[PDB]
UniProtKB/Swiss-Prot annotation:
Keyword terms of this UniProt record: Chloroplast, Membrane, Photosynthesis, Photosystem II, Plastid, Thylakoid, Transit peptide
Whole-protein residues included: 107 to 437 of 437
Any one GO CC term of the record: photosystem II
Gene Ontology process terms (BP): photosynthesis
Free-text comment on this protein's domains from its UniProt entry: A 7-bladed beta-propeller torus, about 54 by 55 Angstroms, with a depth of about 25 Angstroms and a central pore.
Disulfide bonding pattern of the chain: none
Protein name: Photosystem II stability/assembly factor HCF136, chloroplastic
Amino acid sequence: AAWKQVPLPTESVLFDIDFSQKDPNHGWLVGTRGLVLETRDGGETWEPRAFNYRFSNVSFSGDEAWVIGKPPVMLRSTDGGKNWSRILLSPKLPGEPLLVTALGPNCAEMVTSSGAIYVTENGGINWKALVRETIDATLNRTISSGITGASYFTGSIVSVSRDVHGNYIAIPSRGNFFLTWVPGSDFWTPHARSTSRRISAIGFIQNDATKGIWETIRGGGLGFTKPNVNLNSTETIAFDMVDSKTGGYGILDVAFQDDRHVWAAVGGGSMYRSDDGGKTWRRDPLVSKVGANLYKIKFFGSQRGFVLGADGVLLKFHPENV
């Protein structure tokens, strides 16, 4: 039994979990309706805590942690969690905070619904922007069959993740294409999708763009790219499509434990598995419960893993059993 559920005292839906670098068993998890829980035994026991909003993510560097939420709210602690400090955000910052990533002492990068990317180096006081050009400024500049032919661009992005070398990947609200940003470039680079249908989710293979990109198509599609893709090249990135075997249910997130073992969360409350890269897929029947929803998978090395779901469902990864 390779996953198994950690019970908790809340009915809120879990959104993110991260662990301190100084004590790798010390970690925090965030959710809806002001949900914040603390761990010091590696995600086996949790106890509620306070600094109420929807908390989107948490991110550690050293012992410094950053949290953001909706409506726009940010907090950090440099104590592992002893004491947290509110951080005011500007109304001319476009969109609302979508992804924070802890970079080091007093350093963090924020990505907003608008696609804007900001770094602070003084613990939240100042935010210097990283991307000169807004996405719709570049979308008004593309000829590669982006949204500018099919749909009009609702100006927000979805499913944004950061690479191990600081590359970003994201998707427009309506899935018509996807977007990437590598450090130093003045704009996101838009890429045409490889499907009939539209894209639902996207990310990097074990958090490294040098191993490729995965995508989830609506109605259960799934594909991966060859390693070493130039995310600045406008020459359409080709995905190799795979038979997810999910039925009509859509994939919600994909996560690699290593090169060969892959896991996926599916709309039916199910959990799918691959042990040959992402090439052939199975549906793990002893971990899938119907009713409870599964939204997100996150590994911390190949021997720590969690799955976050609605109604306070959290599953902890058990390498004994794969």
